[PDB]
Design a protein around this motif. Sequence first.
Motif, PDB file in Angstrom:
ATOM      1  N   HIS B  53       0.800  -1.220   0.000  1.00 24.72           N
ATOM      2  CA  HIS B  53       0.000   0.000   0.000  1.00 24.72           C
ATOM      3  C   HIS B  53       0.836   1.275   0.000  1.00 24.72           C
ATOM      4  O   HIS B  53       0.276   2.356  -0.209  1.00 24.72           O
ATOM      5  CB  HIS B  53      -0.946   0.010   1.202  1.00 24.72           C
ATOM      6  N   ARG B  57       2.735   4.983  -8.149  1.00 21.91           N
ATOM      7  CA  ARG B  57       2.473   4.472  -9.490  1.00 21.91           C
ATOM      8  C   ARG B  57       3.709   4.525 -10.379  1.00 21.91           C
ATOM      9  O   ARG B  57       3.827   3.725 -11.312  1.00 21.91           O
ATOM     10  CB  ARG B  57       1.324   5.249 -10.128  1.00 21.91           C
ATOM     11  N   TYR B  69       1.218   0.752 -17.501  1.00 20.34           N
ATOM     12  CA  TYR B  69       0.500   1.262 -16.326  1.00 20.34           C
ATOM     13  C   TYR B  69      -0.688   0.397 -15.924  1.00 20.34           C
ATOM     14  O   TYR B  69      -1.607   0.876 -15.255  1.00 20.34           O
ATOM     15  CB  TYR B  69       0.046   2.713 -16.519  1.00 20.34           C
ATOM     16  N   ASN B  70      -0.691  -0.834 -16.312  1.00 24.97           N
ATOM     17  CA  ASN B  70      -1.664  -1.812 -15.865  1.00 24.97           C
ATOM     18  C   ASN B  70      -1.204  -2.409 -14.539  1.00 24.97           C
ATOM     19  O   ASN B  70      -0.001  -2.440 -14.259  1.00 24.97           O
ATOM     20  CB  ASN B  70      -1.824  -2.906 -16.913  1.00 24.97           C
ATOM     21  N   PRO B  71      -2.132  -2.842 -13.680  1.00 23.89           N
ATOM     22  CA  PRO B  71      -1.731  -3.365 -12.369  1.00 23.89           C
ATOM     23  C   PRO B  71      -0.907  -4.635 -12.486  1.00 23.89           C
ATOM     24  O   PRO B  71      -1.138  -5.474 -13.360  1.00 23.89           O
ATOM     25  CB  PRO B  71      -3.066  -3.631 -11.669  1.00 23.89           C
ATOM     26  N   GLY B  83      -0.801  -8.084 -14.568  1.00 18.85           N
ATOM     27  CA  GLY B  83      -1.986  -8.629 -13.948  1.00 18.85           C
ATOM     28  C   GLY B  83      -3.054  -9.001 -14.957  1.00 18.85           C
ATOM     29  O   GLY B  83      -3.028  -8.618 -16.126  1.00 18.85           O
ATOM     30  N   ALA B  89      -7.190  -9.505  -5.797  1.00 22.87           N
ATOM     31  CA  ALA B  89      -6.943  -8.084  -5.588  1.00 22.87           C
ATOM     32  C   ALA B  89      -5.931  -7.820  -4.483  1.00 22.87           C
ATOM     33  O   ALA B  89      -5.305  -6.754  -4.479  1.00 22.87           O
ATOM     34  CB  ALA B  89      -8.255  -7.365  -5.272  1.00 22.87           C
ATOM     35  N   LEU B  92      -2.434  -7.796  -6.106  1.00 22.38           N
ATOM     36  CA  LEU B  92      -2.309  -6.900  -7.245  1.00 22.38           C
ATOM     37  C   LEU B  92      -1.703  -5.578  -6.798  1.00 22.38           C
ATOM     38  O   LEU B  92      -2.037  -5.057  -5.730  1.00 22.38           O
ATOM     39  CB  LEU B  92      -3.668  -6.665  -7.909  1.00 22.38           C
ATOM     40  N   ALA B  95      -3.710  -1.460  -8.292  1.00 19.01           N
ATOM     41  CA  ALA B  95      -5.157  -1.438  -8.428  1.00 19.01           C
ATOM     42  C   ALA B  95      -5.797  -1.025  -7.110  1.00 19.01           C
ATOM     43  O   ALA B  95      -5.227  -1.213  -6.032  1.00 19.01           O
ATOM     44  CB  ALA B  95      -5.675  -2.808  -8.860  1.00 19.01           C
ATOM     45  N   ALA B  96      -6.995  -0.457  -7.199  1.00 17.73           N
ATOM     46  CA  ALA B  96      -7.679   0.066  -6.029  1.00 17.73           C
ATOM     47  C   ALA B  96      -9.139  -0.362  -6.036  1.00 17.73           C
ATOM     48  O   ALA B  96      -9.703  -0.717  -7.074  1.00 17.73           O
ATOM     49  CB  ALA B  96      -7.583   1.595  -5.958  1.00 17.73           C
ATOM     50  N   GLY B  97      -9.742  -0.332  -4.852  1.00 17.12           N
ATOM     51  CA  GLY B  97     -11.155  -0.613  -4.713  1.00 17.12           C
ATOM     52  C   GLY B  97     -11.978   0.657  -4.681  1.00 17.12           C
ATOM     53  O   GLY B  97     -13.050   0.731  -5.289  1.00 17.12           O
ATOM     54  N   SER B  98     -11.483   1.664  -3.967  1.00 11.59           N
ATOM     55  CA  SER B  98     -12.118   2.973  -3.895  1.00 11.59           C
ATOM     56  C   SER B  98     -11.053   4.044  -4.075  1.00 11.59           C
ATOM     57  O   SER B  98     -10.008   3.997  -3.419  1.00 11.59           O
ATOM     58  CB  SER B  98     -12.848   3.163  -2.562  1.00 11.59           C
ATOM     59  N   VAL B  99     -11.317   4.999  -4.961  1.00 10.88           N
ATOM     60  CA  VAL B  99     -10.375   6.081  -5.242  1.00 10.88           C
ATOM     61  C   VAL B  99     -10.391   7.049  -4.064  1.00 10.88           C
ATOM     62  O   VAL B  99     -11.446   7.614  -3.744  1.00 10.88           O
ATOM     63  CB  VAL B  99     -10.720   6.792  -6.561  1.00 10.88           C
TER      64      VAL B  99
ATOM     65  N   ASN F 101      -7.558   2.263 -12.274  1.00 10.40           N
ATOM     66  CA  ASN F 101      -7.499   0.803 -12.390  1.00 10.40           C
ATOM     67  C   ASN F 101      -8.325   0.132 -11.291  1.00 10.40           C
ATOM     68  O   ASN F 101      -7.832  -0.674 -10.499  1.00 10.40           O
ATOM     69  CB  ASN F 101      -6.051   0.307 -12.395  1.00 10.40           C
TER      70      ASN F 101
ATOM     71  N   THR G  65     -15.217   7.661  -7.929  1.00 12.71           N
ATOM     72  CA  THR G  65     -15.259   6.225  -8.193  1.00 12.71           C
ATOM     73  C   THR G  65     -16.444   5.859  -9.077  1.00 12.71           C
ATOM     74  O   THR G  65     -16.301   5.099 -10.043  1.00 12.71           O
ATOM     75  CB  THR G  65     -15.324   5.452  -6.877  1.00 12.71           C
TER      76      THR G  65
END
Lengths: 120, 104, 121, 111, 109, 104, 111
Positions: B53, B57, B69-71, B83, B89, B92, B95-99, F101, G65
């Motif tokens: 974490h 980038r 720039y792909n995870p 990936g 996830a 990985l 990559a993110a779940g929430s921005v 991503n 998001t």
Amino acid sequence: VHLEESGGGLVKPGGSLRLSCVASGFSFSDYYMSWIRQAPGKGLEWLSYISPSGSPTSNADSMKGRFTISRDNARSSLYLQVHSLRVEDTAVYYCARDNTVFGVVTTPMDHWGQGTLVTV
Amino acid sequence: CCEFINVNHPPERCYDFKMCNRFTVALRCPDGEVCYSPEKTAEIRGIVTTMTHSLTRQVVHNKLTSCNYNPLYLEADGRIRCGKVNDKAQYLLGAAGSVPYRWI
Amino acid sequence: QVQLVQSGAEVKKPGSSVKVSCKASGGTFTDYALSWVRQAPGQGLEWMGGIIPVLGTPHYAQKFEDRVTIIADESTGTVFMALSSLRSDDTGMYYCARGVTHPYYYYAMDVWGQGTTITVS
Amino acid sequence: QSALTQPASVSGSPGQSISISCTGTSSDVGAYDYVSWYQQHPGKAPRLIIYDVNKRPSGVPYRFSGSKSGTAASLTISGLQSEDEAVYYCGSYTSSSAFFYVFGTGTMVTV
Amino acid sequence: SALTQPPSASGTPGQRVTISCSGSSSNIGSNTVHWYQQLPGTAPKLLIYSNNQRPSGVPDRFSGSRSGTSASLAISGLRSEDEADYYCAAWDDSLNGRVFGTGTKVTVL
Amino acid sequence: IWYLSGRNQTILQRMPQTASKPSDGNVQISVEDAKIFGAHMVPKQTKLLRFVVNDGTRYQMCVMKLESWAHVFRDYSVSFQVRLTFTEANNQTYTFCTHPNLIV
Amino acid sequence: QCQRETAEKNDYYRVPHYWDACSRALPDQTRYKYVEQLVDLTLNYHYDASHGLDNFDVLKRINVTEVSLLISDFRRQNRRGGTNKRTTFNAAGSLAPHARSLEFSVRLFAN
């Protein structure tokens, strides 16, 4: 660091007895401790280890189902119990302290205790 | 790579990881380059994943430049591959779940 | 062109606090980043902290978190340094610095103040 | 790193071109780019001669020339004169948790 | 003990001893090798805890080395205190467990 | 109450339900409400708003650009078109705001 | 659409924007709620903007998001609320190396 073992000697076949190891100098309960038996004739074979606060991990594929490792983290102590005492189980036992890093094993068996002889 | 491989206490606020040999990972942390190498491979991920974490980038992009720039997916033996969308996830990189946005 | 003007030289007894002020002119104050670079006479440069005005979070180094506080008050382009627990290693040459090319991102260190001397002995 | 690994002093002769090196980590130089350089005469404030990697402001001379390869950076000063006798520092943006800007140890270029 | 070693070796005071530990791609080829020394009548002691790493207390004349799915332990400048038993160990993923060697005898005359 | 005069007209209450359904019939509004919508709306406007995002141990500053057209046609049909684009505040490529991503 | 057959044959080479082109398509009950909330927020903002009282607090409720996922799943297929006689709502997405745009048109009728 200090590891003292106890619980051996002359035991008749068919019984069961527990081998205990006491650790000293360190009490964070994050210890990946292991046991090794060594039959006379100077041969070391790995028995088992155990997670720092969790489940044991089984033996090798030579023979299985006979050895159990227990922990008492309140005493910071390690224990081995044999299922049956065959006459080939006469051996000297070592408890070894591995200290884990992030939950994986680093420094395997950097500290060994005094071996305990079991005659059967 | 390091010359001191397993002597350091667990670090706290690390920001980079590097593979020098097939067994030793080097965590760049504020105390320096703390190296580690387990008994087994396919457990390097258990060390590296604790600091994923903190990766930015650009560091991720220069860990594998040709992947656009792909995870990235962390393999078990510490290798990086590009990936795929059905990969896990937790393993990985980037990559993110929430921005994590915020308005001024 | 953006100009930077610092405060005067200071002698400090040990166990004191310093309140170094810096002013700027000729540029966009809030969008761009400001930083404070300290060098000992026997040492090189060292970024210790900075702020981008009206962002809510000044940035501190790990060697200066418990002693250095940064304030960006007043309507003019000024900024204030409160450092506590002065030691002998805190004697040196301090520079106000500011960037003019890329806003918000600490990318380059464009304009430099003439510097102040903080001497503790 | 705590600082960019930089030489102590380089003492090239007048009339020649000299190269100053700078080695950093892959989280400081070579990932973020933005390899800045700074000039200090003994009494003056530091002066930005090269920013980004190769951008050179109109207020500094034409002779400086900076570049980056891998995790290393170079500054080629061509046609050395007596004004160049100064301490040259490197600097970069970092992803380090400790701080935000990395400063090099400084090379004393004596002509 | 799935790791194969020669039974014994011999030397001279001040000479070199090379101990070979062999295995397959499932134990050494994926996981590290650690060499342990047991002096006669004592608890065993860690000698090399990575492919080439010494702990604090082990002199610099002990050296570990790696070749594919096998390992080597070199003792330079043999003394009488080096006369012990040596055991190589490596983790196996197929058996899922730690595997030791047969055992080596280093005799100094 | 000029601001509250056309606050709750039927077009502004019908369009969110129209955009959230695959079909909304062929007629929904009238001509007087269309005239009210034509009177109460600007033809075009654009705003830029600024948001920061946390990328690893660092940050990235980015801009939402929100532009909109509002129109009433000759057949008393209303329209309200919105273009919302995301940009990096200093025109940098393959950033976190352009490409988060995400995984759903 | 996504050419998944040859997108991931090589473990180190990717065409740009692989992730959004071949992500999981959003569910309908989530996508339509996202579209409804975005239309409501932009419509309230545009009404307050045509009045001149710039209530920009309604733009703070716009989720980055949600809008980015709407651009991601509207890029490959353009969902429309089209009635059999005339279209009422449609949307499209745009992906650039430096930009990421969402477009939609809502048309109501009185005939």
